[PDB]
Structure 1
Amino acid sequence: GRCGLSHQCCFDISSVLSSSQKLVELDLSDNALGDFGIRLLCVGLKHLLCNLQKLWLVSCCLTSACCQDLALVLSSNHSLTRLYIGENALGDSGVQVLCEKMKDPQCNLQKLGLVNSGLTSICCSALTSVLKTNQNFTHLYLRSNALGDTGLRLLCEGLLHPDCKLQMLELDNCSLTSHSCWNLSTILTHNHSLRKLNLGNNDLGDLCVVTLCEVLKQQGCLLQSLQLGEMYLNRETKRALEALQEEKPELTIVFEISW
């Protein structure tokens, strides 16, 4: 991670990923594995039978032009189930590939960190497809992404598929109308989809957290936690939020903004 590294390692590590029967995770972080070395990586992964568990391509300066190969190796292998691609240089136009990674069950990809993407609508539509179809898809770490209200709306529409087991989820950056959060809370009430959630730099307004605290107040939607940061909202929101946890510890915590 962050090591002085380049494309050359790719074939090498592919070779050892083939010949290794002991490695269970391998991290490639902040290292200039630009592209086509991701191809060498994926061919090394799929060609033999390897007991790989994690695979981190975080901040590796790749593009969508290798995501198809990532999907191929993900379909072929089943040992790999934890695939961070964290906020590298991809986004839209990989969206069809993003979906067809998990277009069927038995993919076995528990967590899937995501990227600073581009056009929200199509990628979040692929996310809805994976959420409604794929089993054991425990996390979806969309973070610092230009995702819109329509995007997250169709995301909760993806949550509308019941029996979809999706644990901890996150929507970091967005600008929504304060009914969308109401839809997600109500859909959690309808079915205990996830456990916690984060809202980061989301400009949501007082009424947003007001609806949030009411819906959690009456048989709370989520059951574990919720994290809110960096708002300058008025303080009767704080009074309502500080009230509700002591009567109901179901919402174990809301991350207090500053006070």
Structure 2
Amino acid sequence: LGDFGIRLLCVGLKHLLCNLKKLWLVSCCLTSACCQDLASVLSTSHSLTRLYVGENALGDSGVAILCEKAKNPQCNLQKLGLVNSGLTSVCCSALSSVLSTNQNLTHLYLRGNTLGDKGIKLLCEGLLHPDCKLQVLELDNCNLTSHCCWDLSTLLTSSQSLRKLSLGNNDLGDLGVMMFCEVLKQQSCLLQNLGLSEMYFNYETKSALETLQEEKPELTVVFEPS
């Protein structure tokens, strides 16, 4: 269902009496060209809350379009599946704007996007905003490294809305993770799965993670690979 298919599909999505709530357009050979129509659906639709458009060519220039309308505080978007969209840090300022302004957005899935450390810093500007209500943030293969741990650490204790943070298959660094343990103990509200899957650590780090689960029993799970 390439870009043209979306132009046609959006005819129904923007239509009155269209009560569709969840729409998956994952891997539909889409490009940023279709974002102009999807953005309109997000703006006008009274019912669409779950939009999954990852595994597409909706790169930074595409997300910026979706964000221009998704940032509207009256938008009903709750879950945004911009997974393997080929995003870079370039559009994280747009995602940040949406996170900051759109109080209805509770789940954002960015895995597969090579956002790097710059992207995390930009997202944090929104995530740490008092009006951000994001609960679940997924950051697996996002090409992150240890230099972003200070910003992720900030989110772990400073974001009062965040509940889950699915860090994953990226070379984050085991030392960085040990820092997370120390800060999470400081009354963090991040009680859901912390990810860190497919991420390997030395002994001291693994010990720290096991300790965290015991010392902070309100935490659902670390979910180490071994």
Report the TM-score when normalising by structure 1: 0.81
Q: Percent identity?
A: 82
Aligned residues: 226
Contact 2:35 2:63 in 1 (8 A): no
Match for residue 97 of structure 1? 65
The CA deviation at 1:91 is: 1.1
Q: 5+ residue gaps in structure 1?
A: 1-32
Greater shift after overlay, 44-53 or 55-64?
A: 44-53
Match for residue 78 of structure 2? 110
The CA deviation at 1:243 is: 1.3
Alignment of 1:211-250 (within 5 A): 211-220=179-188, 222-250=190-218
Residue 208, structure 1, aligned to residue 176, structure 2: yes
The CA deviation at 1:163 is: 2.7
CA distance in 2, matches of 1:119, 1:137: 19
Counterpart selection for 1:148 from 103, 109, 116: 116
Q: Which has the larger radius of gyration?
A: 1
Counterpart selection for 1:48 from 10, 16, 19: 16
The CA deviation at 1:153 is: 1.1
Counterpart selection for 2:50 from 82, 106, 113: 82
Q: Pick closer, same or farther for the CA change 1:35–1:214 going to 2, 3 Å.
A: same
Q: Pick closer, same or farther for the CA change 1:234–1:134 going to 2, 3 Å.
A: same
CA deviation map 1:170-189 (0-9, x unaligned): 11123445352332333342
Match for residue 37 of structure 1? 5
Alignment of 1:123-134 (within 5 A): 123-134=91-102
SS at match of 1:209: helix
Whose relative contact order is higher, 1 or 2, with alpha carbons under 8 Å and at least 6 apart? 2
Greater shift after overlay, 112-121 or 101-110?
A: 112-121
Contact 1:215 1:221 in 2 (8 A): no
Residue 70, structure 1, aligned to residue 38, structure 2: yes
Q: Pick closer, same or farther for the CA change 1:78–1:181 going to 2, 3 Å.
A: farther
Contact 1:167 1:193 in 2 (8 A): yes
What letter corresponds to residue 112 of structure 2 in structure 1? S
Aligned Cα root-mean-square deviation (Å): 1.7
The CA deviation at 1:114 is: 0.6
Residue 160, structure 1, aligned to residue 128, structure 2: yes
SS at match of 2:68: helix
Report the TM-score when normalising by structure 2: 0.92
Contact 2:51 2:79 in 1 (8 A): yes
Match for residue 225 of structure 2? 257
Contact 1:45 1:73 in 2 (8 A): yes
Contact 1:62 1:90 in 2 (8 A): yes
Greater shift after overlay, 92-101 or 103-112?
A: 92-101
